[PDB]
Structure formats: C-alpha cells, structure tokens
C-alpha cells in the first residue's frame, strides 16, 4: 500500500502507475501535450506535464511513477512558470493566428496558451509560408508554421502502420518532420492513411483540400453535383457539432447536404452493396476454380498502397471489384445518366469520406472511363463539417430527411463496412447465399467483429470449410505476414483495413482530445452506430438492396460478368 499526498490531500492506493494517470483517475488537473499513445517525445519532452515532487524537484508527470511517501504539488508557482515558459517557447516558433485556422475550434495548443496565459518572447510572423508548407501530396499537407515538434505524428505512424513513413528530418541544420528524404509523401512507402493527422494536436498536419473542386462545381450552372457519404460519416460528424459520441446523425446529414445545394443525395453504402455483389460473386468463382487463394479485399486505399509498396506479389490476389467509392463513381457516370437524362460529362460526383487515402484513390489516372472520372472530388468528414458551419447551417437542430433512393438505398451489410470485419461479414452473407443457391436466415458473423488486431475464423460454404482472416490495422498486416501466420493455414478470403478499428478511425475523422480518448472507446462507440443500423434495417444482405437489384436488372446485368466485368472492376499490376 502506497500513501501519497497531492496538493495537501492524502490518497491510499496499490497501483503501479504514473503521476499523470493517477491524477486523471482521481479528478486532479495535470496538463499534457506530447504524451500520446503511451509515449512522450523522448528526444525533447515538452514538459507541459511538469509537477513538483518535494525532495526531488520538477518532474514530468507523464512518465514518473508514483512512490510511497510522495508529496506532489501540481499547481505551485515554480511549476506554473515552468509550464508557461515551455508554452512561451512554443509560441516563438508558432504562427499564432487562429482566425482562419482549420483547428480553431478544437486545438490542444490554443487551450494550453489560454490556460497558462502564455506569451511569446517574440511573435512568430513569417512572411513567406512557401518554405513551410508542403501541399504536393494528393492526400496530406504540412504547415510547419504550426508544428510544435511534439513527435506525436512520428510515434503514431510507427504504432499504427510500422512503416515509419513519418520521420524526423534535418532541413538546413534544424529539425522538421516529413516524409523520407523530404520527398512528397505519395512518392514514399507512406500509406496516406492520415493517422499522423489524427495524432497532431494543432493544424500542422491536414488533409489535402478538395473544397475548391466542390465550391467550383456547385457554382457551375451546367454541373449536376451529386454527393454521397461513407458509412463512418453518419457515426462521427456529430462530434464536431457538440453532440457527443455515438450519435446517429444520418438524417441530419441528408438535410444539410440539400441545404448546401447538392443536386442529388446518394450514399456510398449503396456502392458498398455493389462491391459485395461483385466481390462475393468473385469469391464463389474462385471456390469453383480452386483458386487463386487467398483473395484479399481491395476497398481500402491504405492497404492497396501497403500491398503496392511492400507486397507487390499479392496484387494479383486482390479482389477485382472496385472499392465502394470508385464503383459508385463509375455507376454515377453510366447508370445514373441512363435513368435521369443527364449528360454524363455534366455529372460531378463528390464523396464524403472518413479517409485521406481516398483522395489518392479517386485521383488515380486509370480511375476513369471515356474521359470521365469515377470520382471528381473527395472531402473528409472534417471538410464537410467546416462546409456546414461556414454556411451557418444549424446542424444539431436539423430535421431528418432521406436520401434519393436510386443510388441511395443500402442494406445492413453495406451499413457495417465502416467497422473492422464489416466487409468480411457483408461478403459472407452474400457469398453463402450465392454458393448454396439458398436464402439463409442466419447472417450474423460476430466472430469477425471487434478490435482484436487479427481475427480468424473457419466458415462453412456449400458443405466445405474455408479459412478467413480480418486484419485490423496496417501494423497487423505486417505482423500477419512476417510472423508466418499467412502460411500457417490455407486462407481463402482476407479483409485488410489500414486503420485500426476500420474506417470509423480513419485519417479524415474528427480529432479527439487525448483526455476524451481515455474515457471513451472511439473505435467501438463509432462502430456501434453502424451495427445498430444493420440490426434495424429491413434488408441485411447486399443482394437484397431493392434499388441495387433494379440497377443490375435494368442496366448492368449479372455481377462479375458482361458489363459489370468491363466497367466495375480494377486490377493492380
Ligand atoms: N470506398 C469505400 Fe468504404 C465503404 O462503403 C468507405 O467509405 Fe470506408 C468507410 N466508412 C472509407 O473511407 S473504405 C474500406 N472498406 C470499409 S468502408
Ligand atoms: S494551430 Fe491552434 S494555436 Fe495555432 S493558429 Fe491554429 S488554432 Fe491557433
Ligand atoms: S499517412 Fe499513415 S503511413 Fe503516411 S506518415 Fe501518416 S501515419 Fe504514416
Ligand atoms: S506535425 Fe503535429 S504531431 Fe507532428 S510534430 Fe508537428 S505538431 Fe506534433
Ligand atoms: S481503413 Fe478506411 S479510412 Fe483507413 S485508410 Fe483504409 S479506407 Fe481509408
Ligand atoms: S513530457 Fe509529459 S506531456 Fe510532454
């Protein structure tokens, strides 16, 4: 038993924990900055978590263990001046202009500046930001006028992907962060997954903006601008409107998009059901053809880049079905004109994604046909939130509306795509019906759900056993391959998501304050919205989507052949 005194209050505990963790468990106020994902910035600790231990002096609470007999003061004059001096030194390298800043509303640094009334010794006012900004990437951007050199992005890249694509660099004899050799991120092994963005406490790292494309398209009188949102968006964007976590705001989004002036309100979950139609058909074909095995999902751009950069020998095993975004986009320029009369060249297709890598995918040169892009613009959940706020739309008080059904209806199988294992479960629901020529009532595959890094299961399809795996995070793909687990069984179907937890934890998602991250399981609570929708939807199999079956019946024909094969597929070499 340890007896500790903190600000003159005695505590008795048996835990082996840091001062910071004990304080947070006991409603004691200690600030922190560089401590994230259980690590601080080892090569320059920010020391914002400074506390006083009588008899020892100032220590960093984030990595100092509590000991019996400790007497801790967290708010003494010496502690305060220490922290305020460190924030002051950060202001000296920080362009403090929150007005036009894209983190103005939820910035960790602004909060600390206000809390400690910190003041620069010399305001940082660069006149040429071109040497500080890197906008070369199709997915990520760097603004080093905001960078605190807290190392959170470098540590989060290593933890989440194990690529170490985000590095410390020496530019002109001083320290920056960036890609290898300061190249454009796209030209390195970087996955463009944006987990570095999610870890950034300020506006230093951001998504590559597509707001110019959307604004210009909405302003062009001849353009018919369609919009369709990813599964994860309806489970997360409410966080940026003070609505809390785990709120289903699907109907509010549809209304907001209409008020923004979009001409048609569809949904990427419709494209998810399309992807299942092609991919589940493909899986049954590989079963009939005895291979090739395994088939990998191909809907995650971060995983595709991981395969391209690290495992190119696996590219031919990726499912040929386009991702829900790109398969939706292809149909928006072909099927949708056939039921509307629109000139296909005048259709402008915008998606809202919880993902930065989707911008790279939509901009791939071959993701077009007859000169028409599958997808013309991709905006993140964060981008849509700012678009709604800039238009002064009272999102939290909007009435519910519905999507336009022709490419907007979706089944419960498409609805769960945004969670790790969702693509697997959705695919199996259709694959089993396809292969057994039956309509099975049992459709729930809970063995592939949850936040385990690697999830494996044996499934029975048409009186034979098959091995499936769900890889939850790019770092677990490396583990799955390097450990030899890939060879320990004959796998037949493998889902890979680059982001831990699936797209609900994507790099385009709302930032979450580090304290909130310790109090709520963001990955689980966001995903629970999607599984809740699947539970209450009248159609829970992709091939039972009534608007989808009308589209295949009246336009595309049979999945995996004929017209669907020419147009809805994509292979990587
Ligand atoms: N394309 C596509 Fe996907 C779908 O449907 C999204 O939109 Fe995902 C989400 N949410 C994202 O980003 S991508 C990977 N597969 C799972 S979900
Ligand atoms: S990063 Fe934060 S402190 Fe800096 S300008 Fe933006 S909102 Fe203000
Ligand atoms: S986008 Fe992903 S892979 Fe690239 S540096 Fe950021 S965290 Fe690492
Ligand atoms: S880019 Fe963001 S997370 Fe990375 S060191 Fe700079 S402030 Fe920290
Ligand atoms: S898991 Fe989802 S959000 Fe993350 S990189 Fe893949 S598609 Fe994008
Ligand atoms: S040294 Fe503790 S939060 Fe940075």
| Domain spans, the chain | 1-124, 125-208, 209-573
Per the CB < 8 A criterion, the answer to whether 272 and 231 are in contact is yes
How many other C-beta atoms are found inside a 10 Å radius of the C-beta of residue 217? 20
Which residue(s) pair with 228 in the sheet? 266, 351
How far is the C-alpha of 96 from the C-alpha of 144, rounded, in Å? 12
- Rounded to the nearest 10 degrees, what angle do helices 422-436 and 268-289 cross at? 50
Which residue(s) pair with 372 in the sheet? 369
Ligand 5 near 502 CB (within 6 A): yes
Indicate the DSSP class of residue 520: S
SS3 248: coil
* CA atoms lying within 13 Å on the CB side of residue 74: 20
φ, ψ for residue 171, nearest 5 deg: -110, 110
* CA atoms lying within 13 Å on the CB side of residue 15: 15
- What is the experimental method? X-ray
Q: Which two tokens stand for residue 363?
A: 């901009």
Ligand 1 near 418 CB (within 6 A): yes
CATH architecture of residue range(s) 1-124: Roll (3.10)
Ligand 1 near 423 CB (within 6 A): yes
How many other C-beta atoms are found inside a 10 Å radius of the C-beta of residue 470? 29
Per the CB < 8 A criterion, the answer to whether 469 and 495 are in contact is yes
SS3 381: helix
Which residue(s) pair with 349 in the sheet? 226
- From the CA of 411, how far away is ligand 1's center (Å)? 15
Q: Which two tokens stand for residue 150?
A: 């807290």
Place of tokens 């909007």: 398
Confirm or deny that 300 is annotated as ligand binding: yes
How far is the C-alpha of 420 from the C-alpha of 175, rounded, in Å? 36
Q: CB-based burial of residue 3 (10 Å sphere; 0-12 exposed, 13-18 middle, 19+ buried)?
A: exposed
Nearest to 468 by CA among 268, 286, 278: 286
Cis peptide before 313 (omega within 30 of 0): no
φ, ψ for residue 245, nearest 5 deg: -100, 150
Indicate the DSSP class of residue 39: B
**CATH: 3.30.70.20, 2.40.30.30, 3.40.50.2000, 3.40.50.970. Which one for 125-208?**
3.30.70.20
Place of tokens 């009939």: 288
Per the CB < 8 A criterion, the answer to whether 61 and 19 are in contact is yes
How far is the C-alpha of 192 from the C-alpha of 138, rounded, in Å? 9
SS3 228: strand
**Ramachandran region, residue 8 (left: φ > 0; alpha: ψ -120 to 50; beta: rest):** left
How far is the C-alpha of 169 from the C-alpha of 177, rounded, in Å? 6
Ligand 1 near 417 CB (within 6 A): yes
How far is the C-alpha of 139 from the C-alpha of 363, rounded, in Å? 10
Measured CA to CA in angstroms, residue 228 lies from 231, 378, 467 at distances of 10, 10, 34
Nearest to 326 by CA among 567, 573, 572: 567
H helix or E strand, kind and range, residue 571:
none
DSSP track, 288-316: HHT-S--EE----HHHHHHHHHH-GGGGG
The answer to whether the Cα torsion of 27, 33, 39, 43 is positive or negative is negative
Question: Which atom number of ligand 5 is nearest to the Cα of residue 503?
Answer: 2
How far is the C-alpha of 146 from the C-alpha of 97, rounded, in Å? 10
Cis peptide before 109 (omega within 30 of 0): no
Nearest to 239 by CA among 227, 228, 252: 252
SS3 203: coil
Per the CB < 8 A criterion, the answer to whether 76 and 52 are in contact is yes
- Rounded to the nearest 10 degrees, what angle do helices 77-91 and 108-116 cross at? 130
Place of tokens 């991250």: 517
How far is the C-alpha of 299 from the C-alpha of 542, rounded, in Å? 16
Q: Please choose from 97, 99, 107, 141 the residue to mutate so as to test ligand 2's pocket, defined by most ligand atoms within 8 A of CB.
A: 107
């Amino acid at each position: 038993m340890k007896t500790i005194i903190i600000n003159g209050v005695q505590f008795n505990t048996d835990e082996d924990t840091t001062i910071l963790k004990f304080a947070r468990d006991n409603n004691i106020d200690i600030s922190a900055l560089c401590f994230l994902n259980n690590c601080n910035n080892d090569i320059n600790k920010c020391e914002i978590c400074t506390v006083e231990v009588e008899g020892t002096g100032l220590v960093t609470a984030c990595d100092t263990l509590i000991e019996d007999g400790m007497i801790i003061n967290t708010n003494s004059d010496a502690v305060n001046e220490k922290i305020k001096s460190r924030i002051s030194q950060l202001l000296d390298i920080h362009e403090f202009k929150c007005g036009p800043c894209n983190r103005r509303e939820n910035c960790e640094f602004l909060k600390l500046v206000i809390k400690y009334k910190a003041r620069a010794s010399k305001p940082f006012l660069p006149k040429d930001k071109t040497e500080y900004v890197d906008e070369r990437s199709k997915s990520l951007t760097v603004d080093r006028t905001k960078c605190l050199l807290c190392g959170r992005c470098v540590n989060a890249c290593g933890k989440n992907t194990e690529t170490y694509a985000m590095k410390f660099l020496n530019k002109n004899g001083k320290t920056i962060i960036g890609a290898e050799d300061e190249k454009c991120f796209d030209d390195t092994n970087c996955l463009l997954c944006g987990q570095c963005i999610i870890a950034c406490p300020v506006a230093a790292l951001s998504e590559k903006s597509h707001m110019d494309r959307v604004k210009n398209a909405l302003n062009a009188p001849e353009k018919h601008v369609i919009v369709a949102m990813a599964p994860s968006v309806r489970a997360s964007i409410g966080e940026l409107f003070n609505m809390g976590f785990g709120v289903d705001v699907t109907g509010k989004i549809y209304t907001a998009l209409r008020q923004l002036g979009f001409d048609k309100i569809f949904d990427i979950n419709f494209g998810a059901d399309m992807t299942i139609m092609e991919e589940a058909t493909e899986l049954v074909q590989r079963i009939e053809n005895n291979g090739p095995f395994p088939m990998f999902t191909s809907c995650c751009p971060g995983w595709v880049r991981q395969a391209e950069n690290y495992y190119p020998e696996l590219l031919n095993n990726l499912s040929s079905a386009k991702s829900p975004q790109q398969i939706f986009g292809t149909a928006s320029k072909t099927y949708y004109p056939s039921i509307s009369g629109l000139d296909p060249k005048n259709v402008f297709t915008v998606t809202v994604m919880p993902c930065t890598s989707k911008k790279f995918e939509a901009d791939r040169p071959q993701m077009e046909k007859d000169g028409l892009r599958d997808i013309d613009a991709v905006i993140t959940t964060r981008e849509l939130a700012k678009m709604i706020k800039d238009a002064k739309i009272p999102f939290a008080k909007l009435e519910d509306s519905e999507a336009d059904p022709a490419m907007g209806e979706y089944s419960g199988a498409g609805a769960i795509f945004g969670a790790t294992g969702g693509v697997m479960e959705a695919a199996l629901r259709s694959a089993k019906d396809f292969a057994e020529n039956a309509e099975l009532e049992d459709i729930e595959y809970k063995q592939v759900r949850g936040l385990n890094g690697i999830k494996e299961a044996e499934v029975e399809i048409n009186n034979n056993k098959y091995n499936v795996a769900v890889i939850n995070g790019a770092s677990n793909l490396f583990k799955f391959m390097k450990s030899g687990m890939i060879n320990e069984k004959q796998y037949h179907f493998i889902e890979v998501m680059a982001c831990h937890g699936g797209c609900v934890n994507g790099g385009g998602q709302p930032h979450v304050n580090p304290k909130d991250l310790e109090k709520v399981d963001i990955k689980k609570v966001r995903a629970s919205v999607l599984y809740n929708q699947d539970e209450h939807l009248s159609k829970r199999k992709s091939h039972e989507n009534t608007a989808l079956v009308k589209m295949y019946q009246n336009y595309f024909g049979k999945p995996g052949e004929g017209r669907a094969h020419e147009i809805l597929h994509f292979k990587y070499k």
